[PDB]
Every structure is written in C-alpha cells, then in structure tokens.
Amino acid sequence: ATRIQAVYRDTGVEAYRDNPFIEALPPLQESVNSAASLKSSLQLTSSDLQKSRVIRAHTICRIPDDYFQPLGTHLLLSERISVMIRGGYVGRNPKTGDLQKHLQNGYERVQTGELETFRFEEARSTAQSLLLIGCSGSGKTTSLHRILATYPQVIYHRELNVEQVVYLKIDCSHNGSLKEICLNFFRALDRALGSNYERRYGLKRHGIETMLALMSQIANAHALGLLVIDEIQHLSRSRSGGSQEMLNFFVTMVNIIGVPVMLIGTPKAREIFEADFGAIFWDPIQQTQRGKPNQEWIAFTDNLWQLQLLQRKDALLSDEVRDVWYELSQGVMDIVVKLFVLAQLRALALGNERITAGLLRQVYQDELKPVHPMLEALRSGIPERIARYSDLVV
Amino acid sequence: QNGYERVQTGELETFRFEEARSTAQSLLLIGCSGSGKTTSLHRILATYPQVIYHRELNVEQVVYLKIDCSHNGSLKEICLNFFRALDRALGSNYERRYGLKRHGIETMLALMSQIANAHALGLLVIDEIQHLSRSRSGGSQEMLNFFVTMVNIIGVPVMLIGTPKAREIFEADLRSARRGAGFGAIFWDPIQQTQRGKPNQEWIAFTDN
Amino acid sequence: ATRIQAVYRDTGVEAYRDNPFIEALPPLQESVNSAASLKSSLQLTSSDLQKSRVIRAHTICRIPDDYFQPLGTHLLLSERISVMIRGGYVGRNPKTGDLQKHLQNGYERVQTGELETFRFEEARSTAQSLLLIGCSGSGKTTSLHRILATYPQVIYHRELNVEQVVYLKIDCSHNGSLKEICLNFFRALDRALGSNYERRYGLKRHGIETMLALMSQIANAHALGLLVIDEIQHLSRSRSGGSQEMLNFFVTMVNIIGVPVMLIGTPKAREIFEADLRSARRGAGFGAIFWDPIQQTQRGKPNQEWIAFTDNLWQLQLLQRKDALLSDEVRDVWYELSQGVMDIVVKLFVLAQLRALALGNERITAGLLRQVYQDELKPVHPMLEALRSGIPERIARYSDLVVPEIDKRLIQLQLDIAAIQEQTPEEKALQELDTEDQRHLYLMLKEDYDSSLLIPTIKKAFSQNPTMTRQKLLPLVLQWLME
Amino acid sequence: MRNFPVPYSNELIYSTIARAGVYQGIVSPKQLLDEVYGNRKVVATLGLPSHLGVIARHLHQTGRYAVQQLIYEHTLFPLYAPFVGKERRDEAIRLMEYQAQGAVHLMLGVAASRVKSDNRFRYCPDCVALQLNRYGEAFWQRDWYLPALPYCPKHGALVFFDRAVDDHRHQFWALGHTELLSDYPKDSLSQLTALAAYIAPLLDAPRAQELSPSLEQWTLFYQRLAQDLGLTKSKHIRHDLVAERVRQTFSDEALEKLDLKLAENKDTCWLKSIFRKHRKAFSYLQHSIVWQALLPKLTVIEALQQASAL
DNA sequence: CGTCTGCCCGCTATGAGCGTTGCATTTATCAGGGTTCTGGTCCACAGTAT
DNA sequence: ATACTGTGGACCAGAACCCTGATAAATGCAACGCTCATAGCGGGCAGACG
C-alpha cells in the first residue's frame, strides 16, 4: 500500500529499451553487493549488559524476529526471481500496442467461457515457472519475504493510469476447494491495493469456469508481476477431479495468459507433481560437506554466538558446543535459534550466568519433547527409518 | 520517495521499501486433569485490563480473549464462538451481522483477520482442545490443516490447553509439531512428596496453609 | 460546570410565577443593553506602529478572532432564543403537578360540577422549533457561541437532587450517519455532566427507536433547556438511507423529546424540510429566520449597517502610509468583489495588509484587493457569481463552499514576511531617530513636509529642554518649524 | 474505479467509457453503469453527453484532463457553440457539468431529432486499418459522427449497419474487431465530401473557445456581405444570384441527401429565412453552404473572424 | 436344544457444499392533459405607376 | 408627386408531444431444501455348550 510515483531508468539490454513497466523497477544488483544487502542483525551495544534482568529478557527474546543471514542458495534464488520477474513484461508492452491485444482477448474468454479462445494470433506471451521444495523449518517463507522486499509493491504511473502491482502472494485453502483459491486471489489484490474487487466479482454467484477467466483478465487489468502460491500441499486434499484441474489451470496461465507463477511446497506434495519446469531442492544444512567441516555452519554459529546478553559469558566458542548443537538439532534452521534462545533464557533465570553443554542438554530434553520423535529418525540416519512420516527428506 | 530517487540516481545501492508481518508464534500447555490449568490462567490474566480506548487514535485494544471448545467437536462452532465471545467484551452485533450459514469455513478464517486488525488483538487462548481428538470433524488431518492454516490470522499469538490424551494423537507430524511448541511446550505434573529422600517444602507449606 | 447554588430572583410576569427552574436564570430587565454589549475589539495604539514588521504581522493575524460588531439580526435572535429558553419550563413545573394530572383534573371537573368549558389544546412542544437557514460564511456559529454562553450551563439545585442543564450542542461531521447524532447526544451529555452515560446507553446493539426512547427518559429526568443540532449541511443523504425519511426522523425527534430544539442548515438542506415549510399547517412548525448578507443600499441610499461596519473595521488599520479617511472608490469596489458575505469581507482586509507589507508601498488600492481576490478566493468564485446572478437555483447549487486551510496559508505569509532585506525610508528615519515617545510628534506631523529638517529640529528642542510633556512639546516644535 | 483508460486523440467519450468496461471483464450492462457512475438511470448518448466531471474525477490524478478540455476537445459541442450565441455557449457548460440531462438538448434548441435520424452505428473501412496499425484498438471517432453528413471528411462513405441507440438506452457498446467489417462499392457525392473537408477543421481549432457573434451582429454582417458584391437590389432581395450560385456549386441530389430542398416557388424557404433578420438558432449546414456559395477562398475560422469583427 | 451375551453391518444420524423457489422486486403498459412549437396570418411600411 | 402592390417583421393559434401517475406482468435473488459422503449403532444371524 506504498503509493510511489515512478521515475524511469535507462537499461542497457536492448530487449528492455521501451517498456515503462520494466524501466520503473530499481536496478538489479551484482552478487557481491546482494549478499551484503540482505543481511541484518541486532543493535546490541554494551550499555544493556548492566541493566535490569527483565529489561534484558525481552531483548534476548527479540533475537529470532530480527536476525537473518544469507546462505549460499539465496544468492541464486534472488537472481532467478529477478530474471523471472523481469522476463514477464516484454510481452505486455503498452507503448507499442501489446497490452491492448493481451487485454482484448481476455474479454472473449469471459464471454464464451473457454480459456483457449484467441482473437489475435500475433499476441505472444513469455513466462517462467519454478518450484521450491524444502524440508519444513528450513525458513523458505522468510526468504521469499526478504528477497521479494526490494521491489516496492504498488507503483503509480502518470503518462498511463496503470497502478502496477509488482508481486502478490496467496495461501491455498486448507480443504483445497476449487472456489476458495479464486475467492482468495480477490482478497490479496483487495488489501494490497485498497479496493472492493471481492464484492463485484465474488458475491455474484458464477460458475468456476467464468470465475477462472475473471481472474486471468483482472490480473492483466493491472500489470501483475508475480503470483507466488504458498502452501501447495493442500491441493491433494480436494475432491475428485480437482487434483489435476489446478495443475492444468496453473500451466494454462503461464503459457497462454502470460503471468509468471512459482509454487512452494513441502516434500510430501511432490507426489501429485510426479503423479503424471526448473526444480530447486532445499535440504537442511550439514557440517560434513565432503571430507572437511563446512564453513557456512561455523560462520553462522559464530554470528549467532556474538549476540549473547549474559553478564558473565565465554567470549570464545568451543567445538564441543558446536557438536552438541549439530547432534541435538540436525541442522534444520528452526531448532537452532529456538534452542539457543531457550538455553540462554534458562541460564539468565537460574542464576548461573554462563551457557554450558549440560544446560543445553537439560533444556533440549525438558522443553522440546513434542519435537523429539521426528528428530530420532533424523539422528539415526537410516534411509528406511527416515522414509516414514511426512515432511522429511526424500 | 526520497529513497526511491536516491536509488534510481545511483547514490544509494539498497533500500527496504516494505516488509510483511513475520511475528506469529504459538504455544501449547498440557497437564493432567485436575491440576488447575484454568484457575491458574484466569488469575494471571486478571491483571491486564481487557478494553483500552485511546483518545489520540480511534481504535479499541482488546488485550486478550478466551474461547472454549464445544461438547461434540467441530471447527465451525469454534469459528462462530470467536464472534460470540468477541461481541460480549465490546458492545456490538458481530454474531448476527457476520455469522451467517451461507459462508464456508475458509471465508470465516479470512474474515477473522479484518476484525483482528480493526481491534489490536493481543492474545487468543483456546482451552479444552481435548474434545477435538476424534469427532465428526471431517478428518484428523483436515482439522490439523485447519489448526495450521490458522496462521493467516494477523499475528495474535495463541495458547492451546489440553489433557495428555491430546498430545500423542494431535501432534504426529513435523510441520504441525514445530508450531505447537513454537515457544516451548510447558508440561505439568502433580506434587511429589519425596524430592530426593527429603520432604519438599512446597507440599508442607501448601498443606499447612 | 459553574455549579452555583440557585438564587431565586422574582420576575413580575404572571406566567413565570414561583417556578424553581425559571427563577435561577439571570434576570431580564436591562438585557437590551446586555444584548448590545456583546461588542468586543482589540485595543491598538500608535506605539505598535514603530515595532518590527513581524510584530505587526502577528497583530494583524490576531484580528479575525477577537473582532465582533453586533448587527440588526443579533438582537432578534437573542430575544427569540430568550423567549424559547424561558417559555420552555411552564410545563415541567416541579412544585405543582405535571401536564397529565392537569388534563385529567380538567376532565374530571368538566364532568359534572359547573366548569362549563375546558380547552384541551395544550402546548405544541413547548416553543416553536426554529430553523435558522442561511448561506454558509454568514456567521451563525459564532453568533450562537457567544449569545448562548451568557447562561450558566449547570445550575445545581439543593433541595432537589437534579441538574438543570440549560443548553446543549450536538455537532455532526463530514459524511455523517443517522445513528451518529443519537450516539453523539449521549457522548456530549457526558462532557456537560461528567458522568459515563455512553457506557450504559451508548451500545451499538440498540436500534434507532431505543436510542430515542432512552433520550426521552434522560431528557425528562434532567431539566433540559435546549438542544441545538448544528451543521446539517455536512450530512450525506445517501449513506444514511432514504432522504425523504430524514424529515420523518426529525419530526419523531421533535415530538418525542418535548424540549425545545433548534436546527441549523444551509439552503441545500432546505429541500429536506420544504414539504412542511410551504404549508401553513399548525403542528408542522419549523419557523424560519432567514439569514441574508449585508445589503449595500436602502431606499436608493447606502444602508447604514454597511457603512457602520465598514468604518469600524477600517479603524483597525495600522498602515504606515495610511490616510485618515477611507476613499469612496474602494468602498464601491470591495462590495461587488465580495457580495457582502460576512466571512470573506474580513478575510480580504486581513490578507490585503499582509500582501501590501511585502509587495512594496504600505497602502490600500483597488488593484491590491483585486489581486488578493484572484489569489485566495479561487474555490469561492462560483458561489460569489451565483449570488451576483440572483437566481435561487444558482445560489442553492453553490452553497456549502468554503475556502480550505486559510490558517496554514497565514503561517507561510508570516514566514515570507520574515525574510526580506531592503528597507523603506521611513524605517530608516525611525531607526536613526531616538524614537522613545519622541516619535509621536514626528509621526503626527511627518506628512506636512519633508522630514530632513524635522529629524534634527525635534532633537534640538528636546536637548534644549529634556523635561517636557508632549502637550507642551507640541507648541514648541510647531513654533520652531515655521521659523 | 481504479484504472480508467485515458481517451485517445480525437475520440468521443462514449467509446472511452465502453473501453473502461471492455478492459476489466464486465459484461452485464447494469454493472458498468453501477461502477462508472453509481446510478442505474443514467443514459447513453452520442454527442453532447452529460454527467461529465464524474468522468474527470477518475482521471484527476493525471493533471492534464479537466472538465473544459473534455467538453471542448472530446465531444461534438464545438459545432453548436460559436453560431448559436455567446451567453448560451457560456451557460451550456454549467448546465452540462452537473446531473441535468433533459435541459441539455432543450436549451440548445437544435437537437429535435425526434426519431433517431442516422443514429445507427457508423464506421469507416480505411480508417480502422490505420487505427489498428498505429494503436492496436478500434474506437468511435468524431470525424465519422458528423450530425448531418454521413461521410468521412478524408474519403469515402460511412458503412451503415443495423442497430440504434434506442435499441438499448442503458448500454455502452465498443466496436468489435471480430465483428466483420465488410467493404461495399464506394458511392460518393464529391460535393458532400468537399463540404465535409471544409467543415472538418472547425472541430479542432483553439480560437473557437469564446468567439460567438451576436444575433444583431449576424444580421449586420449578412446585410453588409450581401451588399458588398451585389447580392441585394435596392431594399429588395434579388432571388436569382443566390439560387444560381448554390446550384452551380451544389447539385440537387446533394441537397436531397442533406434533406435541404430549395423552394423558389414557395415563399417559405430557409435561404430567405437566413437573409431576413435572425431570431432563432441556425444549424452549421446553412452557414457553411452560404459561406461556400458566396466566397470560395476563405477558411472557416477566418470566416468567423470576418463575421464577428464587423 | 435354550440362550446368550457380545459381533456386525446394513442401517440411522449428521456435517459439508451446493441448487431451486416463492417472494419481493422491478419493470413495463395505458389514459390523459396542457404546453411550447412551429405553421400560417397580417399589417404598417417603403417603393413604384397615373 | 400620391394610390397600388410587394414585403419584412411582428404576430394568432391548432397540434405533436411528452410527461406523469395508476395498474398488471416478468423476474432475479437471498431462503431454505436437497444431496452427498462419512462415522457410529442396536436387532439379527452364525455360533456353541450341558
């Protein structure tokens, strides 16, 4: 809802030389500066070390919300998202008369109710697709809230009157019913823009066939850049005939309509995709990269370690603590931060103001019991034993 | 806008235009029946006043709101009981205006967010989660999908209370287990007479008082 | 909260005889002079002229708020509101019985006995619900704010534990709603009483009928004098509901509550009540006192109101190059410039001095007023020419127009006044001369001739005799000049 | 509405409002009026539309388009303003900016068409190709919809097909490319094309903003112009030179296509009504044909210059 | 062979999602009057025949 | 130089209209009704011993 006037750049690539849409974005950045731009941390300062205990407890508890570190893959993800969000505007140019054809055709599909109806054969669409499969707790949503936060959402032009929306994010309904995805697409463009599309398009009882074309034409009423779909595993839980319907509609949209789409899901949602696109697989971090310990694990552990807020602490880290972390957490990105925060919270509350391995073990075995059974399979490492359950690596 | 011109002209190489909300965390509290998990919550939450009205702005701050599950067990009565417990703390008629039969479950979940942002809701405690273990809910995995798709409600950290029968049946998947114990799962137990061969001062003091 | 104990004066009128509610009000025997004493004005002396230009700018910026000159219609409005306030308590007599007991007793006496005829006409409300329709920018709100604040708001009684609220003020806002007035009445009663009536009666669950039902109870419990709804012009018809049902709702308000009620509006709002106004029906009521701008001419001669206001407003000028007498040409021009609308006539004079302090010479010209007119009256160009046209439809369509945000523009005027480099020759003369009460002679005789000889001559006389009064100083400085 | 299309160069506002509903998948004719204006009683009009200002508030954030530019550059109002009268010209805008609709046609007392005469939807065979190639869209244009002449000023004759504005009063229709545009053998009257070319530049000319000669001014100008080169006898109308000029430059079939029969036998003829002292508003056709007949080497704007100056 | 005391399974009860239907609702149809409009009128006025 | 005739401007008056209210008919639309799938249940059948 950040209304920003647009002032254009002058791009270098000849394919982008005319569009206002692709010349309104902030420039793409080299991988050297991109890694430094993403990183953020806490202010700290030693003035708080001698303050009261209660004032220190909340500062300790504010660690997991304001602490992000770029790993190796995020620098690839940022580049791929930038390319895949810039490549979706070269076929919808309003200056040379291309958006008018892409928008005039969409009226015919609304009239007849078929998505293969075309009026202008000259209209060509360019789009890309991706899927981002990773183990639960690996922090894949926050990556798509920090990579995709450089681009402002709503930019307003003045030569035209188009209010471009750069990115939009929806969540599939838990039941996976074929009407609620369409009814929730009109509830993100409804808040990010401040309008009432839902009342004029959803309350009037239409069939699914027309409601699907209304989406594809409203998305081109503006200049939609990215429709990323989170929580795709619920699609398997719908009624019969819907498992394939929106695995064909979401490839019709990419091929014909021309709006890029990326899908994000858990490993147990891979089966419907494989029940029959570039694939990026995310795995929990491991220290044992080939024959020597990985540098990323050590660097991240030191970066997190320098945020302690205890009056009497060990400034230098010991390798036994690192081994305890890797044997109690198995490297999934959610357990480590919560475990460290809980351990130092218990250390502050008890009176022993320094963190030890025994305290870590006691906190892990006393406060994280609903999580132990699944981590037993990860700790064992047996492929057959780890093959059971869901949401695990396959 | 100023950062936008500075990044367009080349002076500034980075900016943070807007960041969405990423501050939704939950917690579960399970203990044996009769251990006092409700009178140890009403008295703790009786210190914070519920309704706060600000003159400078025009919002009412509902600090906390307590819902109880029904006797049979289904999601729709929980969804409607949110409204039935919200219209009493304030003076309003949300139940008849919004709680109609036409709306589906997903519409109610997407509609709770607007009211939870109109009034700055702080905490939402759900107790007696015991009744939802097995019932005509349409499926254990579907009800678990409901309790995990309750993330789209704007922030509003939630606390879940149930008997030890709820834990094993209810948390049996990693993606839902990590959200139940998002801030540590507090477990309760009865008082022990002998700590390590020495009488506990807690039991003695409680019995004497 | 002026909780004065009720001191019971005696009024010789038979109708107001021995009423505890009425007697606590201020007496009315010399109220005509009191009504004509509403006049207020700033005090300005010749000393403020030699100050720096920022101080003069502040002094000019202070003129709009503390200037008020009573006119003909103010006396009529004061007398009418006094009649409405004091005649509203003949029904709710506390010492004797209420109205229903009186009617029942009259019926029982006319049944048998020898009371031949009894009239059941009773009181229509208790006084007519005046409707003060007038064009926006004429000065209704300030007139009520001053003539309704001379009555103490709360008269806390002693033997009866009741509060005698004498007047009240509801006020709508932009894009209001029908239920908003009912809610705002309860909310505004708390500020006048200090209680928390909104907690128990201000629930949103209640329907529109229940709000009025509770309003009747609370208005009967507290002896209420008046209920002044204001700015009906701000309401939006379509948002609340049916436009023609607003008249029904207002009639229901007038009938149920029973206390005198007076609405305010603009000729745009007249079409809501026009159905009852056209008919001469008794019971519709809603008498209208029309507010009209000041007329220039009367019987083919200039109206005395216009010149009386003009000279009084023209006495407040502190221009350095100012002439004593107002020229006739500007008198002719600003009336056609502003059509006599009360608000903008003062605003043009306010802006003229600020513009002249920066453009150059410190005087008033017709071109300066024209320039101010094209500068800061842009939103009100259509309404002014609609008033010039004289067709009622043109005036009705262009009502409710007001200039936005003049106060913020005044600040940037002052800031622009602050930043200047060059100076006038009179500024040099006052700076170089010892202007400590010696300035007055120089200022009063500056325009006779050039002051080049005057600057050292007054110094010569003053050094000749340092101890003088200005009264004796004037003959000597006059005598040495002619030599 | 959040995205109101900007009008193209030299098009009617009706096609703009139509493209404002073609662009967002609104097919129910009631919803378009519900969203654009908010009232279900608003009418659809070709030429001299009303309720303008609501159409400009949508384009407000663009600082260019305003009420005056919309009415003068994007309607058919320029044809009626200069000739009828100055005060009526100045009051038409204030009568038209607001919600009044009935008074618009009444006050400009020339729109008594009664039955919809040539209000069938019209287009041009060659212009659509140029609009397609330079824009990618097709729209209604002010050049096609001249009130009387059914001829495109540059070329050819307009393609009538069978529909009408009275077929659906509450429907805005945009031109459909997939709706076949079939050519027919061009049957053109060259005099009508020349007249259309002569009258075309008045539509887009800045100087027609405020110049409206007065009624008495019209009378004196016509008397002086008639007496300049000898079109009037001593206090009598010649009745022969005026007829032979218009018959030399215009043939009778052009006049019947314009439905403007001359009547020398009958005393009541429009040509004699023009030369007598004027008391009512006159159409642009009569002034244009008189100007073309009396002097053939003068433009419309400079003709109005000479008419108004003296 | 009674009976028996606990099993099942076709069944009953019930949540979840969608589809008509009477109902209010708007729309459309007919008699009528008076009003501005334009069609036709004329009459003083100016220029020629005796 | 004045009666006779065209004539332009001012002027009566019937007429198409057209606007509006009173009444019947078509109709879209929230208002229940229905259907579908799903989980537990008590009379009935095979069974089986003293």
Ligand SMILES: Nc1ncnc2c1ncn2[C@@H]1O[C@H](COP(=O)(O)OP(=O)(O)OP(O)(O)=S)[C@@H](O)[C@H]1O
């Ligand atoms: N690279 C990282 N650097 C710093 N903190 C991280 C990183 N990755 C994850 N985190 C932390 O881990 C948490 C992110 O987890 P979530 O935001 O829930 O994503 P997610 O739960 O893994 O996505 P799912 O399981 O597919 S719904 C936050 O507390 C982050 O601070």
Ligand SMILES: Nc1ncnc2c1ncn2[C@@H]1O[C@H](COP(=O)(O)OP(=O)(O)O)[C@@H](O)[C@H]1O
């Ligand atoms: N600390 C305590 N001291 C005394 N009584 C307690 C204490 N905690 C709980 N109780 C008793 O427990 C009862 C409440 O139990 P409750 O929390 O309703 O159980 P559950 O959580 O299983 O519903 C109260 O009647 C109260 O008397």
Ligand SMILES: Nc1ncnc2c1ncn2[C@@H]1O[C@H](COP(=O)(O)OP(=O)(O)O)[C@@H](O)[C@H]1O
């Ligand atoms: N006698 C007076 N002297 C100076 N200003 C006056 C006088 N009477 C009215 N006004 C002006 O009228 C204005 C307020 O009245 P107005 O705004 O018209 O009421 P409302 O807000 O109801 O329209 C004030 O700004 C004040 O300057």
Ligand SMILES: [Mg+2]
């Ligand atoms: Mg997420």
Ligand SMILES: [Mg+2]
């Ligand atoms: Mg409990």
Ligand SMILES: [Mg+2]
């Ligand atoms: Mg006011």
Ligand SMILES: [Zn+2]
């Ligand atoms: Zn053409």
